[PDB]
Structures are given as structure tokens and as C-alpha cells.
Design an enzyme around this catalytic site. Structure first.
Site, PDB file in Angstrom:
ATOM      1  N   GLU A  39       0.774  -1.217   0.000  1.00 34.51           N
ATOM      2  CA  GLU A  39       0.000   0.000   0.000  1.00 34.51           C
ATOM      3  C   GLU A  39       0.812   1.277   0.000  1.00 34.51           C
ATOM      4  OE1 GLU A  39      -2.749   0.277   3.253  1.00 34.51           O
ATOM      5  OE2 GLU A  39      -3.853   1.925   2.375  1.00 34.51           O
ATOM      6  N   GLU A  62     -12.440   2.207   4.162  1.00 30.67           N
ATOM      7  CA  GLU A  62     -11.727   2.194   5.427  1.00 30.67           C
ATOM      8  C   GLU A  62     -12.053   3.481   6.199  1.00 30.67           C
ATOM      9  OE1 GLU A  62      -7.511   2.445   4.754  1.00 30.67           O
ATOM     10  OE2 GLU A  62      -7.175   1.115   6.469  1.00 30.67           O
TER      11      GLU A  62
HETATM   12  O1  FUD Z   1      -4.522   3.467   5.266  1.00 27.96           O
HETATM   13  C1  FUD Z   1      -3.903   2.799   6.090  1.00 27.96           C
HETATM   14  C2  FUD Z   1      -3.236   3.497   7.278  1.00 27.96           C
HETATM   15  O2  FUD Z   1      -3.465   4.906   7.165  1.00 27.96           O
HETATM   16  C3  FUD Z   1      -4.334   1.347   6.307  1.00 27.96           C
HETATM   17  O3  FUD Z   1      -4.430   0.642   5.069  1.00 27.96           O
HETATM   18  C4  FUD Z   1      -3.500   0.579   7.334  1.00 27.96           C
HETATM   19  O4  FUD Z   1      -2.762  -0.478   6.713  1.00 27.96           O
HETATM   20  C5  FUD Z   1      -4.582  -0.091   8.178  1.00 27.96           C
HETATM   21  O5  FUD Z   1      -5.537   0.923   8.499  1.00 27.96           O
HETATM   22  C6  FUD Z   1      -3.993  -0.719   9.442  1.00 27.96           C
HETATM   23  O6  FUD Z   1      -5.041  -1.412  10.122  1.00 27.96           O
HETATM   24 MN    MN Z   2      -5.545   2.126   3.697  1.00 34.22          MN
END
Ligand code: FUD
Ligand code: MN
Ligand code: FUD
Ligand code: FUD
Ligand code: FUD
Ligand code: MN
Ligand code: MN
Ligand code: MN
Ligand code: MN
Ligand code: MN
Ligand code: MN
Ligand code: MN
Lengths: 290, 288, 289, 288
Positions: D150, D244
Site C-alpha cells: 500500500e 476504510e
Molecule cells: O490506510 C492505512 C493506514 O493509514 C491502512 O491501510 C493501514 O494499513 C490499516 O488501516 C492498518 O489497520
Molecule cells: Mn488504507
């Protein structure tokens, strides 16, 4: 806010079986169906009552749009046309009263679409129009109808092309039930700012038409919907928001709106229905409570 | 890339003393002046040479724009109108070659503005136009000119309204000197995506007109200039970019463009000069 | 509106020969040069008059920015740190007066950058801060200085992350010389609306920092500049607008700003000057009236 | 296109009763539930089969996210840490194979969040990481797992902050089970262009995270959703889209994500559910 859709999204002429569309949009979750005024002068009393009963039984509110003919041109320099026009509106508003309709909108201060091969007199048309609207407005009030004047792009009218012009014209008319009406498709062309135009309209905004830049259903194009929601919240807009998508070629609607390619991408009725419903969900989600 | 502006920004008719404008924009800093083709056929062979002289002397490159009259309509069902249209273009194009102009653009495949009063036949007009354009293309190729077909919004034309329709028409013409031309004012109305339309035009893109949504000079309106700049880089655009602002009422220009309010907000010639110059700095900065 | 730039755009440390940048920026056309406050306590009255006269000579107005050290933390629970902090700004503001500088800005209610490995007491730090700032604010009134509290993104500060919070803090402090300060790079992360954040700031807005989403010079990125001009006009903003681009890796500035790739793409000094000048032309054009 | 939501939207720690969330999101209409890898190493073998049973029972596909701890840093200059990191991932990947999940994503080439009070050796960390990830890739391929790297903003990581850096890293690793992963929250800070970053990732894009600029659910913020959907169509994206959102203060989640104000504005579970479902409808509609 109350959300609606213009029946013409499904039809190619300025008239149709409105009861069929009332049943359809009620199932899709809309609060409003907007219908074209053209066929209403030919409705018998029992036809008006059935349409009203249909809307009521389905929990749907009817609003009316009208693109006037040159013979119904309230701004005409010909005194006879202005007289025929006032007569036409008077009779129409009484029909609206019988229908339990309280809102009509469109280029009610002129005719549409404008035949630009004829010579133009904005200044002259503007003042005859203000005068004529003033008195039609009085009939509208007696009928419980808000008379909304829609700001249009330059290719469709020349009197009122921006929210500021619309406010100027409406202040000159100076009648409580005469309002400015905006439309995202027309604002998209003429306005320096979308949110600005809405804030300019402010307390005068009485109706709002929605559609993408090329008139697809709201949501998947470039219109700044979030900015629009913010501006409607800034002015405390209470009104209705009626999407007015035009994605099909053919007939008087295709010709007047100038749809020269199949913007619907071969959609059948059910497909059209689904897209309007997704667009309704999007509109309720993005445009409210900002 | 080379930046220009259409002289009509200052004039209300489709003609003017182009020499006065070649000097004005040379001063303002523009690389190109775009001029209306209308008065050109009335230029004698000598008038042509001095116009060209006037341009070379000022370091300004000349491009031509043209909204065809009904009698020059290459899409026409009337064979005599089509015949006259090919004659007009061949004569106009030979003059262009002597003026040392390498690009003409506009609704060259049709006429402008459309009178929607008549009966439209998109399907038939489209086939006639493709054929007539391909022929004219031979002459354009000869005079070393790029015949640019401008995609227009539905109110000004019904044949080609999107970049995709423009590319389809040009591919059908199947000829080297025929290009697609885009205009931010028109794209703003018809396209789902501004960047997407430019990428669709791709290598067929031969000319670009700029202006805000309501036709003000580029910069303080809602057009997505950065996205346009990025998309031109995606396709590697190496053509010119000509602003076409129309902020004044009156005349054939005001009536054809449909300016029904004073968008210039009372600007005088100097004020018009300043805004165009600022828009020029803006365009070179943001777009490249 | 007056337009300026942060000298740091060219330097990797929080100090530099400001007279050199005063001259550079006057030639590029700015009205303002913003300088870091950290070297100023090490200036003699001779250097302060030297700098003032030079600014004055090139017609440049000077504004100050400061990212407070942990020891200058006005919000600290440790009363000794708070006393030293107040002493620090009291001195600084008197120097600003001597320099005829009427504005300082940054995370003045706290310290920068925050060290998140430590203990956070937003509620506690917030109350102590409001109390300390109001005090420092009297000294600011006296020195004719506008104490601007910059709203920062969550990765740089935890006390004030949105214009609304900034406004709540300033209203609570309740002192004429304290203003809210906004920065387009920070609003880009935290705000629901950019025009909305400006408008929320309203009459409390006293300074504006500009830069693209990833801190390049204004104009060729995704920041909504036209929307910003509109909102500045809606609130009748007269203050200054200072671009604060950071495009070079290295040094304290690079590590503090977290520049981990060469965003300038090889720009030498002349190229950096060219872009700042073009960005300044852009800002006056798009942002004004 | 498959749409999911990260379970942490409702929780403040990097673990929870994933069965409860599988039932919840199936009820709200999601296709995927994304869970945190953290508790999985310690799942008995029974708990792994129950979790998998639930997922299948509810028609939900599971994907995994993970912010590695400092001891799991595949980029570490410390060889014992790299050794443990590799052991951690090979054990985690084998479990994933048991749990029937085919995708894991996050700062897998490093650790998260980055402690910046330490020395940053980007070039050295980068070389080691590419080499380490390539090893782990072999195990990921044996377990049928896409190992997605990522791209994060500067404040959370220093190795990969743009799609271009992410693609460069993945091409260097040069292994089919290693992919680039983008997140609208991170792109909003670092990218020149959202659509552009997506097109840069192209065939390498293997997962996408969504969120408004300030991490609220998609829809009423400033993220250009239409532009994202158009770029996903441009590349022909065959992956999933997982929102998310992080709107609550507190716990390891609130401090790792740095939520310092109540962004949810008092929302209770039911209200968080409705906002998630509305954002889901929005995403299916706008992203296509
Ligand atoms: O965007 C991000 C962190 O800003 C996420 O993808 C991170 O890997 C995850 O939130 C951890 O739980
Ligand atoms: Mn993320
Ligand atoms: O925007 C429009 C027309 O362009 C609407 O007002 C409506 O279609 C018209 O009034 C005719 O029904
Ligand atoms: O954009 C257009 C018309 O809207 C122009 O390219 C047109 O050909 C020119 O204005 C004619 O003078
Ligand atoms: O935007 C910020 C920090 O990201 C600045 O205002 C900061 O105070 C200054 O850069 C310190 O030198
Ligand atoms: Mn309308
Ligand atoms: Mn579509
Ligand atoms: Mn689309
Ligand atoms: Mn044009
Ligand atoms: Mn700043
Ligand atoms: Mn650049
Ligand atoms: Mn760029």
C-alpha cells in the site's frame, strides 16, 4: 427536501399517461413526479380528479413544468398574443388548482424553445414580460400556485441566463409567489460559480431541476453535487429538487432538448428505472443536511 | 506549446483589420493570432501577401477559424450546394497556402450556426459529409493545411457533439490532413469526462480552443484546467492552444455566440487587453 | 491582498541570510517574505535594524513563522516549561516590534512537530494553552503583533485540526490580537469543505498559507484555488497570502516536512525562482477579487 | 466489482469478533469484510475454521489488512528482525490459505506507523525490502495470496508515497503475486492526479482503499469519486474496493489513525451502520 423526476425521462412527447408514471415513481421511492402542462387544458373534470386521486393515493406530489409556445408568449410585443397568453395561463392555473398542484416552472416569462431566426428585443421583451408576469402572478396566488421562472442557457432563451438576472427580474415583478428557479444543466453553462449562483438566488429560490452536464441522471458526471448541497444548506433551501434527465433521441422531446445521439446507451425501461432510482438515492445522500 | 487568441475577442463581426491584431497580440505576448476566414476570399493576391508580411514581421503565427454558411455546407443533400462548398474550400485553401497558414478549424463538415428550423437528417448528412470532407482533404493536403473538425455542443450542431463522435467521423474520412478539434466550452456541455475526451481524441487531436464555461478568458471560472493540462501531456499534444473568449454583446458575433448580457462587465479595450494577457500567463503556466 | 513566500522554499534549515531572500523576492515581485523566527533571538539590535532597513529598502513586508520547540510549549503541564515559553515569546514579540513585523504564525499554542511517542492530554493541553496564549496575547497587543494560530493536520498537531476548532480556541482565548490561520495543505487533509472552512474562519482569519496537496507551488495541483478566491471574497479577507512550498529533500526542513523524494525534480535555484514567480502570477490572478 | 468495509470502522483495537462483523456487513449488503491480520497468528485451528465457516455461511469474502509491528519489518537493517519478519509472514500466509483468503495489503514492505524519532535510511531500507518481499512472495504464491503493497502519505511511511514509487518497487520485486495498492486518503495528500495515479498503477493495482479526505465514509467529501471510477474503468480494474472509514477517537486505532476529534459526531452503532450502507450504495453507483 422533496425529490422528484420529470416524466419526460421516459417519453418523447410533452404528454403521456401520467398515472402510469405516478405508480412507477412511487415504487422507485420519489416524493414527486413533475408533469408537462401541455395536455392539461384538454383534461375533463373527471380526468383531473382521477389524476389527482392517483397522485394522492400513491403519496406522490405533482409539480408542473411548461415550455410555452410562441402563441403563449407573455413577453410578446403583439398585444393580442399577450392577451391569448394571459388567458391560457389563467385557465391553466385553475386546472392546477383543481389538480391540487401548487407549483409551475419553466420559461414562463417567454416561450421555449426560442426561435432565434426571429429578431430579438431583450429590453422591450423584458419590460413587457415583467408586466405580464405581474398580473399572471395574481391569478397564480389566488390559485395557491408558485410561479417559478427558470434561468436558462443562452441557446434556449435570452431574457434570463444567470441567477443574478433571474433575481433582478423577480424583484422587478415583486410578487410573493413569483420565484427564481435554477437548473444545474443551465447553470453549468452560464454561471461563474455554482454555489455562488445558488447563494445569489437565496430566499428567492423556489424550485430546482437537476441533471448532469450532458443531461444524464445526477451523480456520474461533472456537476459539483457536494458544492450544490452545501449552497442549498447555506440558503436554507426547503423546496423540491426534480431531476430532469434526457437520454433518448426522437420525437418532440428529443428535438427540443437536442439529443442527437443515444445517450442512454440502449437502455430499456427497466434499466432507465434502475438508473433513476440509483440517482434518487445519490441525490438524497449527497444533497441533504449539509 | 504555442498559444494564441481569436481576434473576435475584440470585434463584433466576422472580419477586422487583422494587421492591427497581429501587432496587438504580438505585444501582449501571444505566439498565435487566429483570424476568421470570412473576409479572406475578398483579399486580392496583394492583400494576402501584406497580411502574411505583417504576420512574419511580428513573429506571430496565423491560424484560421471558420463557421461555414449554408451555401458552403459539405453535408448538404443538394449536389449544387455540395459542389459550391468544395469550390469554396479549394479556393479558400489555396489562399491559406499563400498566406502561409497550416491550420483551419470549425464546423467544416457542416455549417454554423445550424438553423434548427430546417429538417435535420443526421444519418444522411453524416455520410455525405464524410465523403465531401475526404475530397476536400486532398486539396488541404496539397496546400499543406490541417483540416480540423471541431466538436460542438448540441445547440450549435447535431453531427459531432462528443470527442468520441469526432474520432469516429475522422477515422471514417480516413485521411491524413483531417483532425479532430476540441473546445473547452463545448466539452464542458457534452462530455462525461474532460480528461477522458482529450485522451479519446489522442493522436487525432489537431487543435484546441479554450474558454471558461460561459466563454470568459481562461482562469477564474470552473473549467478543470489542470486536468486538461495533464490529459494533453498524456496524449503528448504538440499543437496550439487558442483562447476564444466572447464577452461582448452586439453584432453578428454577439448574436451568433449568443451573448445577451455584458459579460465583459464594461471592459474597455485596455481592460480586455490586460485580461487576455493574464489568461495567457495562466494558460502557459497551468497547461504545460 | 499582499502576497509572500516562505524563504524556506529555498533552504533546508530554519534560518538563512534573510537579506539575500529579501532581495530575491523583491525582484520576483512578491510583497512579502516570511522568515523563520528561530534565529532572531540570536540577533543584536544592530542585526535587527540591518534586516528592517533592508526589507524597507526593497519594499518588502516581513512576516514571521515559527514551529515552537518542546521547550517553548505554551500548553505544557510542566509550569517551568510554560514560564520559559512565555519568556520566549515575550522576548520574540519585542524583537518583532523592532523589526516592524506585525504578524507571527504557526503552531503557537503548542509545539511543532509533535512527538507522538509522548503522552497526549488534548483536553488538558487545550485548557493550559488557552490560558497561556491569552497572556502572551497581551504582549502581542503591546508589540503591535497579530498572534496567528495555524490549524494543522492530525499528523503534525492534535490540538486544532479544523477551522472550527481553531475558531473555538480563538473565541475562548477572547483577545483581539489572536487570529485563526489557515493553510491549504492542512485544510486539504482535514476539512469537509475548503470554501466552508474559510467561511467558518470568517473575521477571525488573519493569515493564509498556500501550497498544493503535496506542497508544490500553488496552481498546477488539485487544490481548489478558484473556490478559495471566492470564499476569501465572501469573508472580505484583506490579510496576506503566503505560499509555503517544500520540494526538496534534506536537512531539518526536509525531515520536519517529511519530503522523501525529490518533488522539485532537479530544480536548481533559477528554476525554483521561475516557478515561484509563475505561482505568484497565478495567485494574484485567481485568488483576487 | 466487489465492495467491502474494514471492520475497524466500528472498533478501537486491531482485533475483534470478526464473526459478528461478517453477519453485520452481509446484512448491510457488502460483498467483503476486511479484517486486521493481528489476531490471526494466534488463532487456534478451530477458530480459523469457524471464521471461515461464518464467512461462507454469509456469502462474505474476507480480505486482510495489516500495519506491521517494528519486529515484523522486512526492511530492517537488523538481520534478526528480518528473519522474524519473514517467519511471521510465512506463518500468516499459510493461515490465510487455511482461512481461504486471497489478499493481504498494507505497509507490508515496512512497518506501521513509522516511528520518526529513529533514523531514516530510505535507500538502504528500500533495497533490503525489495529483496525481503521477493522472498515472502514465493510463499504468498504457494498460498494463493496477493501480497499488496500500500502506498501511504509521508507521515505514515517514507518508502512509498506515490503510485509511481509503488509501481517502481513492485516492478523491482518482479513477482506476479506482489501488487501495488492505493488508498484515496493517501492519494489525496501525495498525488498530482488521482486519475493519473490510478492509471500509473494500471495492471499492478491489486486492491483499493476508500475514504473521504478526512477518513469519513465515501460520498459527501472532496474526494473526486467520478474521476476515480473513470480511471478504474480506464485500467479495467478487476479487484475489489474496500472503504476504510475512521470516525471515532480512542484506543490503538484512534491513536494510530490520529483521530483527535469526534468525527462521527456522536454516532451510535446503528447510525454508523446506516452511514456505511449509504456510502456503499454511493460507491456501487458512482464507481461502476
Ligand atoms: O490506510 C492505512 C493506514 O493509514 C491502512 O491501510 C493501514 O494499513 C490499516 O488501516 C492498518 O489497520
Ligand atoms: Mn488504507
Ligand atoms: O431545462 C429545461 C428545458 O431545457 C426544463 O425547464 C424543461 O425541459 C422545459 O421547461 C420544457 O419542459
Ligand atoms: O467554438 C466555436 C463556435 O462556438 C468556434 O470554433 C466557431 O467555429 C467560431 O467561433 C466561428 O467564428
Ligand atoms: O504548515 C506548517 C507546518 O507544516 C508551517 O506553518 C510551520 O509552522 C512552518 O513550516 C515552520 O517553519
Ligand atoms: Mn429545467
Ligand atoms: Mn453511464
Ligand atoms: Mn461516465
Ligand atoms: Mn471554438
Ligand atoms: Mn503552514
Ligand atoms: Mn510540476
Ligand atoms: Mn502536475
Amino acid at each position: 427536501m422533496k425529490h422528484g423526476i420529470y416524466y419526460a425521462y421516459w417519453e418523447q412527447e410533452w404528454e403521456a399517461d401520467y398515472k402510469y408514471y405516478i405508480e412507477k415513481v412511487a415504487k422507485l421511492g420519489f416524493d414527486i413526479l413533475e408533469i408537462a402542462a401541455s395536455p392539461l387544458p384538454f383534461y375533463s373534470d373527471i380526468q383531473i380528479n382521477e389524476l389527482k386521486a392517483c397522485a394522492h393515493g400513491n403519496g406522490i406530489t405533482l409539480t408542473v413544468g411548461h415550455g410555452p409556445s410562441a402563441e403563449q408568449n407573455l413577453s410578446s410585443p403583439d398585444p393580442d398574443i399577450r392577451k391569448n397568453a394571459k388567458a391560457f395561463y389563467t385557465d391553466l392555473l385553475k386546472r392546477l388548482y383543481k389538480l391540487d398542484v401548487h407549483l409551475i416552472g419553466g420559461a414562463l416569462y417567454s416561450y421555449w424553445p426560442i426561435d432565434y431566426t426571429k429578431t430579438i428585443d431583450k429590453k422591450g421583451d423584458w419590460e413587457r414580460s415583467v408586466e405580464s408576469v405581474r398580473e399572471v402572478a395574481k391569478v397564480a396566488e389566488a390559485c395557491g400556485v408558485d410561479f417559478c421562472l427558470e434561468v436558462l442557457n443562452r441557446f434556449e432563451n435570452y431574457l434570463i441566463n444567470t441567477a443574478q438576472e433571474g433575481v433582478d427580474f423577480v424583484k422587478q415583478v415583486d410578487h410573493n409567489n413569483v420565484k427564481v428557479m435554477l437548473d444545474t444543466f443551465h447553470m453549468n453553462i452560464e454561471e461563474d460559480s455554482i454555489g455562488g449562483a445558488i447563494r445569489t438566488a437565496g430566499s428567492y429560490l423556489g424550485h430546482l431541476h437537476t441533471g448532469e452536464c450532458n443531461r444524464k441522471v445526477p451523480g456520474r458526471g461533472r456537476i459539483p453535487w457536494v458544492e450544490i448541497g452545501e449552497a442549498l444548506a447555506d440558503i436554507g433551501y426547503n423546496g423540491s429538487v426534480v431531476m430532469e434527465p434526457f437520454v433518448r433521441m426522437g420525437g418532440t422531446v428529443g428535438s427540443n432538448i437536442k439529443v442527437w445521439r443515444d445517450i442512454s446507451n440502449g437502455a430499456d425501461e427497466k434499466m432507465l428505472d434502475r438508473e433513476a432510482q440509483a440517482a434518487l438515492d445519490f441525490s438524497r445522500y449527497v444533497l441533504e443536511c449539509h
